[model samples]
Target chain A: STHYLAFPRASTITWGDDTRYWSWATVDFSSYAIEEARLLQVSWLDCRWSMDASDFKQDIWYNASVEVMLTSNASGWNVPLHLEIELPDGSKQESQIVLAGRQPNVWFKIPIGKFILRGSLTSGTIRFGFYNHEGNWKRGLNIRTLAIQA
Target chain B: STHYLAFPRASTITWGDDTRYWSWATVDFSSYAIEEARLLQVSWLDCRWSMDASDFKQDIWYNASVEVMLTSNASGWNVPLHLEIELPDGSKQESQIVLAGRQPNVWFKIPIGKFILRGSLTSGTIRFGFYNHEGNWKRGLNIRTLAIQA
Candidate 1:
């Protein structure tokens, strides 16, 4: 099974109010609709999501990713994005992703992390996030969802 | 762990004869070298690889994928390519993927399939392949390697 959380359903997203640095729009694709967050401008970035082990199947291998699209005129995207995953067992995986040179305006899935769900080793919340607190103002990236796939 | 298999080491490839429709080259990336196949023109395709479960660990989840890149001037890629996977349990996953509208000259991985390796049940071979035998001439695709990741 695949689980998805639209930007609006994330644990936290700085300034996602559709007021400052963000706007909302809906993209319907039949099976479901995507109410995406369009980043207008931001510097202090923090987007994270968490789910409990009880919400998933035991012994299953799953992956987490975020779907995003950067507009043609998007600015300040040369800096690297920090992807983090805090597993239920307290282990963590972190990586720096340089999002430069990719084609703009095309939707792409950026993998956050992956983990195997072991009933005994996992219990509480499993966390994942996309962060870039480098303080460089960036704009025009549309965020669709934080998805978990098995 | 990540593993790679060059095209030269594959079990089969229909037009791999350089004089006719294929060429070969090497790409060195510090840690190791890559032996790749360059497709100039082909219509009948048959490329495949297989691995024994005895070569891997027990109770681990692994995924298989192929790395490829295409040139901007490539032709006849509008049709879909078939991805196949044969597991030890007699189950298979098959999917069709279209190579259209992708940014050319950039390396990308196409996931073939994934399976959890329970050493007991998976004792012999685990097979996977890339096929597109619709009889349409296609050109400009660079083949890298068949990779397995854990």
Candidate 2:
């Protein structure tokens, strides 16, 4: 299932002359008016790397998840999703939460795996999170958010 | 675990490549007084390829299996084995036999999880097999055997 999507070669995600023509962007979940949505799965397609930095050693397998907050109060919560960094050699690693969005922001890891490779990755985005639609219920908040490469 | 001992790339053994370095050779269980033994476990690691002649597509994982048998005076006495194969992508495919080792010529699939690129592998070889040491048996017979890269 790892290769379920088409991804650019690692070389393209590097930097400058090595960087591919495309870059990664974020999804505005707030754009959707649902009161609450759950993340079910993620499918990574590509990545990018920065030139001449410690960024190359990033996990290549797309470790991503998310945190939802009910405004600045940051009172309610949900379980954190853990993802793994996969490699060709059958080895894997993962990451902890690096807070994103505005202050009092809910803490959650990106729902996909992370990329740990030899170079830095800038503007590397992915379909890291999606809505969880199991008949079971969960609450979605219409809060402002920012996505990082974490 | 399947990646324990990898041969040089598409290392293989077949009639065409008689000199293939890695393969099952005759074992000397007699030296250890293992004349009669029941299999306990079998394990081996190898890189395999899917041949194009079989209409195999590139980057597509294929199936493989291994089995053991004993040469006997009776017309039929082959031993059946549980077999499994794990592809490099962490996806697994497996099958089973109802009654194995019932005939002199037994065969079954093995559980291995990696493969070489297309054009590099025409077939895969199951490299390991083990017998139960707790049986009231004599030195085990050196069974005639071959691999099926299914």
Candidate 3:
């Protein structure tokens, strides 16, 4: 059983030079299968997650997807936010985008029961950086498994 | 009454990146206050304070006449969002902005009572950024105040 990454949450890192530094956290469910995952919830103490100065465009929900892949680039790599799960059992697997929130740790539920957590990385790393319109910088994301029931 | 931030009994945090390095927490507040010493039921989190990643917008509702300002800037500052209380009270105040999920530790809120936090920063300390033209980037907005009981 394996699970894939979801949109917005599974995307890349951003920064701005005008400001100082930024921080963030993440959750990775790549090791388990869709059926293995009974309940998935993203919770955060980020009372600071506000839309005060942001004019974020309403994203196209249907086209949004998180991905995991084998890459060669080192710095400033634009990794795709979509994933196609390949279980250890050699069976086919896939997960679609469910939800995304503007705040830190918004929840996105998956119907998958209990599955193996498999991905290129053992766990994703959360990154915090400056916002720059044009730059060559790649950040890491921190992630883990959260099976509330089982 | 002077209110403080607290995480209720049922509050929780979860992981976002692998290696368990990244995570999120939830903060539930019964109430808070601002401006003229009025109190309100403000349920918000201090996601991150003045880092500038993008999603640093908090939702706080306040009186339309309350003064709102964005503090801490070195160059280029502007408040690009449609808010009920978009003007200032000339009482020297600081406005808070919520950072995007990509950003961290910025503060945002939904103003609870009649009071609005008032304080102003210098021009060099705050600069407003907006997403214009190509649509690659979007503008930002802070939280709004709900009501007041004086």
Candidate 4:
């Protein structure tokens, strides 16, 4: 099974640049995990809490993998993301996922290490924080969809 | 008379970001002073050369007022420019031009200040250096055409 998450449907986003926009109908997402994906065209220069993923299941999707559909004008672009997931027992799991180099407009599943779902957690709020240590700037990334495949 | 200078036709450029590209046709430059104008779409981050206007005439175009046709994604976006012109008698003229506040895809003719032809020369190399000190990143100014109207 595949679980798809649209960027525009994210709970909230703290934009680094005001040029980033939320589009519901412009992108082509037929080959994606979900039907009718909303895209967030981003041209961010720095790091911040970019998106908040709400109500995601940690137990069922524990060993599940992650993949993102994105596009860029150039190559050698990497997205370093930190996921902070809140647990049911008032605890939290802070994991890091680094997605590196997927070419332009292709769905590339990263080999980002998996996390354990030991604690009692069914659904939780996962906040996403992005950082860029890479020195390149002035490029855009079209985030079509983010999926967690079981 | 009107003059249209394409950025790719520039003698050389020190790019601030590698993502800046040359489009054959895609921008609106109808209201400009020139006909069949070519544009340079720039997505610059931080501050740097974007392009250098070499072999531009000062004595001939001194009376010709200048304006740039540009577009941005949002309001309140500005491009801070530093103009360095090399004179004939081993001297230089350094000045500043700030283009401020244009809407997205809208043809905005930023009335950048004029220069005097008093500097003992007929023609010179005018190098343009750009920087965005407006504290915003990722978005850039699409310079459709730099027009000199006589």
Candidate 5:
């Protein structure tokens, strides 16, 4: 059974209208991280979505594989994604992921190597940071949900 | 083939002993980003390291994989590393990295996923920002280098 984590339950977010460099997707501000009941479209310049480990089953931390559904608005656009996870053991793993362009809508299953929390857990969190190397604000990334393997 | 980018040639840095936040390492700071000509030691807090991309071969941009070598100084500590890359295309990729700890002095490689430029580069720079979430400054980390796998 695969479990999906929506962006609405994010613990601490660095995205939203309160910040000077951010804004909602025009339709709804809060809806950006909580659209379609299971999708989070990050359309801002800088956005980070985080979640706590306690929110999942203890076994899921070690046995499950993690993936994110991301898409872009245009062709050949590069989306740089940073995924960092902190384990209850007080150890953290950080890695980078790139979403190739023209991938307007697709599911990207992040490799396990990007996240180093294997079979060990108690508490901590996972953070997803979106940024671009070229500073192109015209393009955006649409995230459906953070999926965990059943 | 693999190439190592040293930090000694950093165009500009925000590190010094003038403030209450930072102190010069007992060893020479120039010796950091290069050890045996293939490693960097990022063991400071509130530090920002930046370099201009124009100084290197443009071929390195698309044909290489970038990674950071990270480690901690003490137990029960956390290190948050922020990396930002600016492209000549006028876009920048900024993100955060966390290294939680109970284990100290262990090396970890952080792969940057958001940076994917293939044969497409004009000019830009890379920035390494060191920060702490809890605001505790007693602990530190050692960085080996920003390794580029060709």
Candidate 6:
């Protein structure tokens, strides 16, 4: 049970540079000490995670997912998102899920594929990401944590 | 003690022709049996009420206001709105109110202006309206009723 990033520690978020596309906020709910990333408004989406394979425990399967919520003003998410994961052996896997009927203002975790640490890791790294570039404007998304569990 | 126009009965609304600017919807709540006009998105706002002078009871002071609600996505209203009224005579009065920090989702009444319906008004009419043409994009305002009371 290992939690990698809580928005602030993400490796690379493409919308981080532009406030109009993405922004960060804080919520003091006494539940978990963390920050949130909001998808202000944008037509393209790109978020990636990169870390050394040695960081993960060996000989175990891990599930990768994201904790996200839709806000009241959230719209235009009809196009499904492509969730991807790349193993230490240079093998990649991807899956798609539609976020159309998800309830707003409620936090939920979405399973975005998984991988295994299989055998000893020497050189390759672990790469996992979320991508949706359908060119449709999306708004009011709150991203809390990127989870990787056994 | 007569309620004149609810959104549907309004004399004119500049954004009525465009769906992206103004839209209508009905809330079947067991309250006051009616529909609502939503300010979809627009910069220039215009809503007017025009009716015969004889419709109102004579020899009494009348107060004018609007029943409106700010929605969750409402924005770009930094410049105050110009509330106006035209009496039975050639007299016209205008006032301004900034709606920057108003509460959202909850319905509330806003006082526009007032006038007296004096002895035997025959030739003219009661003209009052809400106008904000600051060229700034606005969204999430729900107009319920244009009020006139004695």
RMSD for all candidates, in order, please.
14.1, 21.2, 22.0, 22.1, 19.5, 25.8
lDDT of 1 by residue, B45-88 (tens): 67776555544456777777787899776888899899998877
Please give, as one word, the docking class of candidate 6.
incorrect
User: Which DockQ values do the candidates obtain, in the order shown?
Assistant: 0.02, 0.01, 0.02, 0.01, 0.01, 0.01
* Residue lDDT tens for model 5, B1-150: 222232322212334333343333322322111221111222444434443343234443322222222233343244455555555466766666565533554445554423444455523444444343454443444433343333
Candidate 1 — what's its lDDT? 0.69
How well does candidate 5 reproduce the true complex, by DockQ? 0.01
After superposition, the stretches of candidate 6 with alpha carbons farther than 4 Å from their true spots are: A1-150, B1-5, B29-33, B119-123
The candidate that achieves the highest TM-score relative to the unseen native structure: 1
For model 3, what is the C-alpha lDDT against the true structure? 0.21
Full ranking by lDDT: 1, 6, 5, 4, 2, 3
Collision count for each candidate, in order: 0, 72, 139, 0, 20, 0
- The DockQ-based CAPRI class assigned to model 5 is incorrect
Q: State the lDDT of candidate 1 residue by residue for A1-150, as single tens digits.
A: 243232433346788774788887766522223366788889977787655554445687777777788887688879998898887688887887777777889888888878887756555666778888887888888876665656
Instruction: Please name the candidate that would achieve the greatest lDDT relative to the true structure.
Output: 1
Cα deviation of B45, candidate 3, in Å: 46
Stretches off by above 4 angstroms in model 2 are A1-150, B1-61, B73-80, B98-101, B105-150
User: How do the residues A1-150 of candidate 4 rate in per-residue lDDT, one tens digit apiece?
Assistant: 332222322223335224343333443322112222223443433221111122233344432223345545433355555445343354555555544544556655432223334454432333332334444442434333333333
lDDT of 4 at B89: 47
Clash pairs (backbone) in predicted model 4: none
Candidate 5 Cα errors over 4 Å, as ranges = A1-150, B8-13, B18-44, B56-80, B113-120, B128-134
What is candidate 5's CA lDDT for residue B140? 43
